[PDB]
Paper text:
Abortive infection (Abi) is a bacterial antiphage defense strategy involving suicide of the infected cell. They are unique in the way they combine the ability to synthesize DNA in a template-independent manner with protein priming. Here, we report crystal and cryo-electron microscopy structures of two Abi polymerases: [name] and Abi-P2.
To test this assumption, we have prepared a Ll-[name] variant in which Tyr44 is substituted with phenylalanine. The structure of Ll-[name] [name] was determined at 2.7 Å resolution by cryo-EM and it is essentially identical to that of the wild-type enzyme except for a fragment of the 21–57 loop. Residues 32–42 could not be traced in the Ll-[name] [name] structure implying a higher mobility and/or conformational heterogeneity of this region. This conformation very likely resembles the state in which the protein attaches the first nucleotide to the side chain of Tyr44. Nevertheless, the structure of [name] variant reveals that a conformational change of the loop harboring the key tyrosine, which can position it for the protein priming at the active site, can be readily accommodated in the overall hexameric architecture of the enzyme. Similarly, cryo-EM analysis of the other inactive mutant, [name], showed that the majority of the particles were monomers and only a fraction of them, which was used for structure determination, corresponded to hexamers.
Residue numbers in the entry:
A (entry chain A), C (entry chain E): 0 to 31, 43 to 188, 192 to 598
B (entry chain F): 300 to 449
D (entry chain B): 150 to 188, 192 to 299
Write the structure that this text describes.
Amino acid sequence: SMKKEFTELYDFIFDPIFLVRYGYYDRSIKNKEFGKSDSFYFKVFNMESFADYLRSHDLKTHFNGKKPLSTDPVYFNIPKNIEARRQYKMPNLYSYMALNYYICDNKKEFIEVFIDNKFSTSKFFNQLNFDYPKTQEITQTLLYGGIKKLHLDLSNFYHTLYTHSIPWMIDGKSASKQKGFSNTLDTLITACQYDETHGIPTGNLLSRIITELYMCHFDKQMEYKKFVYSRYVDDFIFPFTFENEKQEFLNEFNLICRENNLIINDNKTKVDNFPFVDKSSKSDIFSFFENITSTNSNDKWIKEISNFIDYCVNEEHLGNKGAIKCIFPVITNTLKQKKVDTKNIDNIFSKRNMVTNFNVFEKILDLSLKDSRLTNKFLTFFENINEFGFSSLSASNIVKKYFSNNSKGLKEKIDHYRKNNFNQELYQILLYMVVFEIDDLLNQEELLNLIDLNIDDYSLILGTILYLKNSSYKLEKLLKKIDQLFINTHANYDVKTSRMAEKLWLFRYFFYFLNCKNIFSQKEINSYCQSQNYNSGQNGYQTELNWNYIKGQGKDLRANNFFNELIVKEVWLISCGENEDFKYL
Amino acid sequence: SFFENITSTNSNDKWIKEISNFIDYCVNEEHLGNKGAIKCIFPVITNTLKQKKVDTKNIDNIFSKRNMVTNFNVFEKILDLSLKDSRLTNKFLTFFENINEFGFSSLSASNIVKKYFSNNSKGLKEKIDHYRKNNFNQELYQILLYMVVF
Amino acid sequence: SMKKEFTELYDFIFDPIFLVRYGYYDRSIKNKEFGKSDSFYFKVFNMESFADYLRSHDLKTHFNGKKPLSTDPVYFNIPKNIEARRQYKMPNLYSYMALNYYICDNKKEFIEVFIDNKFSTSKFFNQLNFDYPKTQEITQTLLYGGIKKLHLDLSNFYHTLYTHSIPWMIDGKSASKQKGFSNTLDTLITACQYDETHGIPTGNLLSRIITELYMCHFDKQMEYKKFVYSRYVDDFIFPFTFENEKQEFLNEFNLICRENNLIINDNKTKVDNFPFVDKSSKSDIFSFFENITSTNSNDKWIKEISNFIDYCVNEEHLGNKGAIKCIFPVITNTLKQKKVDTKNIDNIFSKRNMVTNFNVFEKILDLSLKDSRLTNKFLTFFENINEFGFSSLSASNIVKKYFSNNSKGLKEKIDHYRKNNFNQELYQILLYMVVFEIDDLLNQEELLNLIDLNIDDYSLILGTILYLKNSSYKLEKLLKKIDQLFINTHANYDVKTSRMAEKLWLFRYFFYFLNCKNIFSQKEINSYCQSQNYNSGQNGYQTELNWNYIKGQGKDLRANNFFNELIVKEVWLISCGENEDFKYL
Amino acid sequence: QTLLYGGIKKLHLDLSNFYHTLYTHSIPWMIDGKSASKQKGFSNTLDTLITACQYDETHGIPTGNLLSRIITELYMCHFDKQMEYKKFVYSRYVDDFIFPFTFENEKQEFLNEFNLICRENNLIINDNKTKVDNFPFVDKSSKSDIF
């Protein structure tokens, strides 16, 4: 039945190993590409090694402590639109696992609410089968009987939520002015973001699960008042016929929002009158390549792909949300279904027109660079067409030519992104440079300029990879820069604070893991420490660069012990390539 | 030309999805100024099912299938569309007669309409009260006609 | 000089007795009516008695405790516009005095920042001489040299400010991840609002002073980047000539906002191009009555006043902000300057036209009822024209006739306001009923319906006054209702919580003060307690209605002792009229 | 002004071509009730005289004199009688209505009853002049500067 299928879904979801293998980076599992929320390159940043370690070792012995350790997340900033920004907070892995274990032991408090709920089309999290059109069917069924539709949307819901209002929603505000499940969940949520009570750390499955529980108690209240609507996260569609219905709904909705410190985005409040508008229809996009077959010339294929990209950008401009994100999946599916030869795939995507100087892969790459949220979409598309026959060397040469041709614009874009803390836009350029072996856009002293403050952890890792890939460069101008960065970061905390509970936890772990595997040769680190006259000790040189000294510094060493167990057992959080040489093609 | 690239060998789920998308497409077309685009929904669904040579068992499966997880039935969507504009009463009822001859059993359609009316009983009762107070003759006529027929 | 005059202003302002006599209710002192922020009727709600008590007694002996007691403020909701709402939080008097004393002892940390500041036109707080046109002159001087003006506005600045970000602004975010002035000020601010770290308690001078200090450190950062602009609270005007100037300013402004968790209201972001638009010009309003003299007939005066009200409402509609609030002051000033006889004042404002059934005072009253933020404006205007000659009995009869004529609409408005927690709209109607002796709009069981939950403290006090004014009614249907309300309110707190640190502190104090002065006869309270079978004790009947029993209940009695000292010394926070009979005309 | 008291919102309604398209036989329907008209009296004789003034044409009222305005005012005063029996308050000048209200349910109830009366009496609403004024109210027609 409905309840059995929901119970199977939530039994599969509410598993700690699942919530770290796919939960941390907000991936989707299809069996035991629209709603896909994947925002980090799986080939570099994944939790496969950590989840493999978890399957055979229980780490709950590290979270027996009463008070949750307060840690600092990775601050990653992504574009909301062409002008606005959205702030992601990637929690410390220790804090993430604490919250993960707590939610998985208290799964009963989430599942029953999710089961009883009727209004949410987002309580399935784009998992195994409950992909987008099924939630669309649920919305359709919920919208029956209404000649009018009222659209409501909370403004900055994730980023401005008062974290202490979670017990107010779950248990009642009054019962909260007086230990329990909601209070402990609140403490763990704030511990994931350094005791900050402003917002929820966004960008993973646990945050979405907690937000869905919060909004499902919202729905519980609003259905107790005998209302019916469809909600996706914080977007409400309320079907109604009579204006008194809308006014009563708005009154109760406003009371609940005001009581819970929620702000309504009044710019998105609209009423649709029947006949209803439906801008986001994908039928034309999916049927764009119906009248093209594998017997057509490769030039026809190139022209149709270019026209298709232009068509989808126009569709996105015309209000068809998500139409650009459908470009890559349906190009891949068309090439796979139409049975196009591998030599033909290579010819289509590698052909450079002698007179127009036009290459279709370069057009797709430029499209990806126009919106940084298309980074993983582009890279997945490239992996697919690489398996189809498009050689990796030709793609690398095309991307090299693009970067060389647009070097001035790319350098000033990097300067802008680094000045303005545009984290994902910088991450995309450095990720393309790492993946496609771009070894001339930035020289040595520009690469060293990215290892500084206000640079996100993933960008720092990608810059370090770019520095290590170039064997000409000397890793002492790098060790000095990294050590200075580590010292400056620790200078912002109390001296009795463990380093892995601070900012740059992921970049620190990257560096110490690389040091243990001896990509940073111990001889040259020793020479650098001697140059800086670092006092030796029982277990090293007492520098920020020495994990043996760092792992025992601080009054509270729970995160240090956690990450020491990961390092000792050779668990990597950043993939160094299939041959440990930082090559990803 | 909405159903050009669909054939009788396609799965019934594909047929249901295409009919739902087609209804949404026609409502959008009517909204965009294409006068009479909703009134073309029923005739071309009927003509498509007749031309594509879809089996009677398949007709019954398409229009009677109730999705276990989304709780979605396409006949219920068409019925709701008909109830949104009372001028579509005879269009809906003619369409139902056609698909009844095609294989969609009358008992299943009656059960679907029963479920819709039971689910939306509150809204329908207040609509009847509004229509009876305001002398909205055809809107009341449509609801009572559906009650009599089904 | 400039600095000496600013120093005199801030020496006068930063005085605890000043910050309670005018600070608490956000009043303005002219010598030792535009920007006036007065939102509560001075004749009922004032701190004259408390400030008089302070001048002769030092209450700092009550705030020697280390940990600030966390108290619950009075939640008062006022309209932001015809559709939106603004939330006021009137702090507990104990918490208010704690924060007041701390700010006055740390005045040096505010004054130097205010002195050095250049960009703020709001760091004067509409005090002695620094009224609106002088801040306009400051803005004009700051806007020199710019052919273009960029307007920026933070969205929901007071109500969504993260209170822990105050140390980030004042001391630097980095120096805050490590006792000081900023941390203690943060603790006191959160204690004023029951440890809630979401927003600043709005509606008093201390909150405006702290907000100005926060924004003056904002200005300090932005001027260190060599920018020039004019800011009023959170409204920025940035003069510029070249687009690179605007882009650089927007970049740095966005960085500071993002770092400090501040949200920009993108709907109010506009660029004015020269020639500049100036909608808010008051010259026509002030010159409306130039060609009218005291020798004109009273009918001419009535017609001109009516036309003037219509003109000002139109001006407000056309974007002339604050044009309606100028109606009452300039009518009063015109009648005073034109030397109109007192008999003529009475004739103008009391004449009821026999055929049109039109009275100008009724029109002004209806205008006041259209926007509840005009309550105090209307009541001040009525006091002025009452001194000018307009008899109080005639005004009471006119308001009686209006309320009787519109009784149905007013009753359904009261029901709407009470259901939707529209605090100021209800407060205005009950205040008009109390002031003008309206004794028939609500009967006994409707009056008792307002003494319930989700009703603000001032509305509860006004309803109690309306009940006591009617000598026919029995105060046992009132004592039962109040006791039930007190029990229900205390049921939402831990049993070891002192009652004066809870919600409804002001209404509780009102009731106990009234009981000590014997407006509630002790005999009838005793009879009610016996009817409810309340167990007696060493010091009373152990009911919520007995201050002798309540004052010693709770683990922490600092607020109880404070308010006990106020009650014992017969300090009133609600004025009972000049003759202690609740009559205010 | 006195009639518009108590309303934070104003709804403006206007009948379209009221004088020129009025069905003259609907005057007894308004004055006496439509039902009592499917069965000599004052209203019938007034209707006959009105049509005689315009050559037995039953389409409109002869416009441009005081008698036509008096009859139109009587017609609309029976309209007002019905609408006040339903406990409504508004200001009407000829066929221009200003309805003061605060809550949207008030406006919807008023529009429902107003539409029923118009439909029953063959009256057409000028939907191009239907507007809602929100406070602060607009006042374009002010003659102070001219005078």
